[PDB]
Amino acid sequence: SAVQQKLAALEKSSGGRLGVALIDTADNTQVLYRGDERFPMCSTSKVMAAAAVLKQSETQKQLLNQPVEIKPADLVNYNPIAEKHVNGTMTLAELSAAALQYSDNTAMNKLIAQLGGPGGVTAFARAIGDETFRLDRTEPTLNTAIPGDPRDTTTPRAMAQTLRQLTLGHALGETQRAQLVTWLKGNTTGAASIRAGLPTSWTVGDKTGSGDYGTTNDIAVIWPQGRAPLVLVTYFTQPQQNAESRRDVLASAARIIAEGL
Numbered sequence: 001s002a003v004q005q006k007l008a009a010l011e012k013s014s015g016g017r018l019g020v021a022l023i024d025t026a027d028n029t030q031v032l033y034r035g036d037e038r039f040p041m042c043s044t045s046k047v048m049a050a051a052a053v054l055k056q057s058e059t060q061k062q063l064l065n066q067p068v069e070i071k072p073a074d075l076v077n078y079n080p081i082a083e084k085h086v087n088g089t090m091t092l093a094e095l096s097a098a099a100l101q102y103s104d105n106t107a108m109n110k111l112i113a114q115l116g117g118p119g120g121v122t123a124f125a126r127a128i129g130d131e132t133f134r135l136d137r138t139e140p141t142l143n144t145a146i147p148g149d150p151r152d153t154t155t156p157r158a159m160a161q162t163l164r165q166l167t168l169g170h171a172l173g174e175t176q177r178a179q180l181v182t183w184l185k186g187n188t189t190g191a192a193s194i195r196a197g198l199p200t201s202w203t204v205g206d207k208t209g210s211g212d213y214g215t216t217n218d219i220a221v222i223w224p225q226g227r228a229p230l231v232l233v234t235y236f237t238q239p240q241q242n243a244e245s246r247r248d249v250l251a252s253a254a255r256i257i258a259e260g261l
């Protein structure tokens with residue numbers, strides 16, 4: 001298709017590997033480019049972890065309000081919120097918000113620990129019907145993004161379907177789904193990625209990620225003006241380990257997708 005040829009041309013000009021999955025829930029149509037290839041999720045895996053903790057809160061009514069100790073040794077490579085609360089506490093709701101909206105890696109590690117380790121996030125993924133997602137490590141090593149390494153990867157198709165079930169479907173209870181969507185809509189890191197390729201009037205909730213090998217990711221629920229929502233996953237990774245981020249490529253893929261709508 002024209003969309004397929006253009007995403008292939010974008011990828012070719014990018015010097016890396018691009019994966020895109022669109023679901024149009026007005027009619028459930030799909031656009032896929034490398035939709036079944038694995039990509040390192042990096043920080044976009046945080047969505048799953050927050051959703052898994054949200055799922056826990058459905059049978060632990062007071063869980064999201066429960067204090068967690070932030071200790072000096074807990075800080076990792078990017079802790080814009082957690083570093084403010086060292087030698088203090090954050091609630092799991094606060095940690096979820098920090099992980100999703102500011103991409104705080106200490107907060108992500110607290111979410112992971114609340115689920116019993118990376119395998120608890122993977123187990124939640126399996127429990128909501130996602131067979132492809134795997135989380136294997138904590139922050140920051142889940143971002144190594146090594147080519148051919150299946151750890152901490154998913155496919156665009158699997159992630160699009162999962163994000164749809166989490167934000168628009170019924171993988172979560174109604175309050176938890178609304179809370180997840182509220183968190184995603186208040187993301188602070190997304191304006192250069194999918195959001196930039198979409199018309200300004202469209203509402204986006206998203207989670208960005210980045211890692212080694214110039215890995216540049218975004219996963220978004222999109223509410224276009226006057227139409228049913230879209231789910232759009234754009235993963236991008238590059239051949240050299242120290243490569244620079246390329247959020248403009250995610251914006252370009254989103255712009256190509258918007259024109260095909």
Ligand SMILES: *C(=O)N1C[C@H](NOS(=O)(=O)O)CC[C@H]1C(N)=O
Pocket residue numbers: 042043044077078102103104105140143189207208209210211212
């Ligand atoms: C997630 O990809 N990470 C956590 C934080 N956010 O990246 S984002 O700005 O693309 O969301 C810092 C970078 C990255 C990491 N390497 O930990």
